Amino acid sequence: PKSMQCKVILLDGSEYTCDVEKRSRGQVLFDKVCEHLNLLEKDYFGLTYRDAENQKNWLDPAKEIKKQVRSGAWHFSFNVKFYPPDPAQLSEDITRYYLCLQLRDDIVSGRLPCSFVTLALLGSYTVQSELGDYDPDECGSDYISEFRFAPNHTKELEDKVIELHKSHRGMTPAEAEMHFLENAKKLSMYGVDLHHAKDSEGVEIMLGVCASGLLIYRDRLRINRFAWPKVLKISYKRNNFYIKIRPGEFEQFESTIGFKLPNHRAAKRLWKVCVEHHTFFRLL
């Protein structure tokens, strides 16, 4: 029974290696990674691979791994797929821990924009969780943390992390991670999966997929939002993505909105993440 080696980048940046039978479905690998992680609340997470166009794809747990990675290496990342709007409602502290690690990467990468003060506050909770109580012995006037807190580090940011860290004495790691999440969950781009597209006029927009629905970012001042309940059908055809927007009260007809994606695979990927978010956040 022939087995393929799998390499998974975990959220702490380390590498997990395991073997699965070469005809395995994605769920098989996902279950192995989740067991390694002692993760029970698995519904929020998934595995990502890079396609031949170097695009991030979700590994479909129902489909064969070989029919997804195709010509590429069996290399994956472990990621948050569905960002919970209220992390306090997760049953386990370890779930909240993996969610914090994902968000720290969302912040450092610049996917999740964040004010100076919130970067410093999130940083201070991470430091409290991981080192415990502030100690002056480790931190002089010239201290720079090993921890990555932001897309661009400044001395002023390091200083503010320490000032806030001092305020958190006696805080336990679960408590500090819960405070991290209470702040992160409020950020306007929390759990927003962005897709480059063009509107029906050819104007360049971003489509955001998240818990609260589909967001259209047009020109900073013009941001349209379609709550999942207002979306009856999600479709794609060639390079085009379509949503059916339910009739308003006393309107005779459903309204259709049309977008141009860079290519046919980008249109299918956007369709599938929308359907998955619609299902997930209809049930949650």
Ligand X SMILES: CCNc1ccc(C#N)cn1
Binding residues for ligand X (CB under 6 A): 48, 56-58, 79, 193, 269, 273
CB of 269 to ligand X, least distance (A): 4
CA distance 187 to 268: 28
CB of 150 to ligand X, least distance (A): 19
CA distance 150 to 107: 6
Q: Which is nearer to ligand X, 44 or 134 (CB)?
A: 44
CB of 252 to ligand X, least distance (A): 34
CA nearest 26: which of 51, 58, 73, 70?
58
Q: Which is nearer to ligand X, 153 or 265 (CB)?
A: 265
Cβ atoms 231, 237 nearer than 8 A: no
- Beta-ladder partners of 216: 207, 224
Q: Which is nearer to ligand X, 106 or 158 (CB)?
A: 106
Residue 61, both tokens: 């747990």
Cβ atoms 95, 6 nearer than 8 A: no
Q: Which is nearer to ligand X, 161 or 274 (CB)?
A: 274
CB of 3 to ligand X, least distance (A): 25
CA nearest 149: which of 181, 184, 119?
119
Residue nearest to ligand X (CB): 79
Q: Which is nearer to ligand X, 57 or 124 (CB)?
A: 57
CB of 108 to ligand X, least distance (A): 14
CA nearest 48: which of 221, 273, 223, 252?
273
Q: Which is nearer to ligand X, 139 or 197 (CB)?
A: 197
- Beta-ladder partners of 204: 198
CB of 51 to ligand X, least distance (A): 10
Which helix (H) or strand (E) is 256 found in, with range? strand 255-260
